[PDB]
Design a protein around this ligand. Structure first.
Ligand SMILES: [Zn+2]
Lengths: 303, 303
């Protein structure tokens, strides 16, 4: 059933992550999906952790570390956050010394503590549905893994005596009085996030790729890593493929040949996924009108 | 100076590795380079560890786990070896039980012990120059890393008492009498391979990719991993890019646009690399005549 209709239908969904090892029209897909979702929900938020301010470049507007209604829509808001900044913002704002001694034993607690607060903010703004646009490189899933990283750090801190009262209490506030209980009440906060992430009724993931060898490979490794993280996934959009059955360009014919044999592999490996196919647009997709028209092919199979 | 001339010139070169995260005409490049090298050297060998028997599919002939002169050339021989086979071949040929208890502490000693013997064979056949065609997926550099893996295992064995005499002596033969010295004489054999690998006069590496985002990313990670392994590298060939300045196909124009902006990034990041650009061929490159004609563009810039 090659269309993202099943996301607009499932109204229980609160978080939808979209990701794919960059260079595959991932950003266009995130946007197109956010627009379509805004037509059928009360309040939609589109957040991106791609530092390349890809979200701005797409809508024309400039977005930043706080929610701004998107020009052209009633209920769609968008924010564009970089973790490396949110890290140095929150640390100087304090202790991190201790967190450093934590930082080498636990790689990426800083990146994870960031994500922890980013989320608490999103939750507080109460959007009916939020679409996460993951980074195009490195660990595309850092965000979904942040409870894991925190929980490790909490295991290392449990065995620590007092005198770390400062940093335990310091971590506790950036997430959400005193005692060892507050050390066990974070564990309850973490357990909460995990529950939601891992609950198919509430949060699912949509992979995007292109019909080439390397992109298939990196995409499989991502789906394995996902089922491993216990995050649900049942959609996969394949972009910039060219499907004019009778094309005359000798090159485009070669391209189409290769593409069509990998698209055949995909169709077969993922019987259990809505695999949606969308064409290569000659012009770069830009502007709140080009985007609207493009989002069409995500809900209506293209021929 | 966009051409692989500098490899035909450097006659001190004994090993040339070519690799790239598959789907980028890597095999065609390895061959084209082997042909050109055969014109200017006494004896050239082209070996591939790509299990997909990509080397056979390219020449038409069938190659296997031993050197066969290539139909159409005087001094060019080719062999096509799969490690997973060479592993079970060499182990049953024995002890591995011990090696297993080694196998989990040291991941991939079996794959590295294999490479150790593959190399001793190549060395014995005394080719003037040998071109290695690396696998298209996973760790493309396992081969250059085999001394490292061995040296770890030798550190774990040094602290072991006698009674491992069997496996120490068993390892010693697959590489190249008795005592603790034989345990220290492998160390000298390993140190030898490392010296050669790391010596720019003797062995260099050539990266191949295509002008897309994902292929650039994986290629950078590979060059970093290289300088880390201390292996020299100063060539990079970019394939299947289409360079007819004035093309009329709307799609090919789009492709070319994207391509040309990433080719711009490459040209800039690698001032210190011979970056050679070669076109997209409409037909699949096959046969000892199509290959000869293609190898042309690796030594003579194409326009
Ligand atoms: Zn074309």
């Amino acid at each position: 059933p090659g269309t993202l209709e099943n996301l607009l239908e499932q109204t229980s969904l609160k978080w939808i992550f979209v990701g794919g090892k960059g260079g595959v029209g991932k950003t266009t897909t995130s946007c197109s999906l956010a627009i379509q979702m805004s037509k059928v929900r009360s309040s939609v938020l589109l957040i991106s952790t791609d530092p390349a301010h890809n979200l701005s470049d797409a809508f024309g507007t400039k977005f930043g570390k706080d929610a701004r209604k998107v020009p052209g829509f009633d209920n769609l808001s968008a924010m564009e956050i970089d973790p490396n900044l949110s890290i140095q913002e929150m640390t100087e704002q304090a202790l991190s010394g201790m967190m450093q001694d934590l930082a080498f034993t636990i790689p990426g607690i800083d990146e994870a503590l960031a994500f922890a607060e980013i989320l608490k903010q999103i939750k507080s703004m109460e959007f009916d549905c939020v679409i996460f646009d993951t980074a195009p490189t490195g660990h595309t899933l850092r965000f979904l893994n942040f409870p894991t990283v925190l929980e490790k750090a909490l295991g290392k801190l449990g065995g620590l005596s007092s005198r770390f009262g400062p940093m335990i209490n310091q971590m506790g506030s950036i997430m959400g009085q005193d005692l060892f209980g507050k050390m066990e009440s974070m564990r309850a906060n973490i357990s909460e996030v995990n529950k939601q992430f891992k609950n198919p009724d509430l949060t699912t993931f949509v992979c995007v790729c292109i019909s080439e060898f390397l992109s298939l490979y990196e995409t499989e490794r991502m789906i394995q890593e996902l089922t491993s993280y216990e995050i649900d996934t049942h959609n996969i959009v394949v972009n910039q493929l060219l499907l004019d059955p009778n094309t005359t360009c000798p090159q485009c014919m070669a391209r189409r040949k290769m593409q069509q044999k990998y698209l055949a592999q995909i169709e077969e490996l993922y019987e259990d996924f809505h695999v949606v196919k969308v064409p290569q647009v000659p012009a770069e997709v830009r502007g709140t009108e080009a985007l609207k028209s493009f989002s069409e092919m995500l809900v209506k199979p293209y021929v």
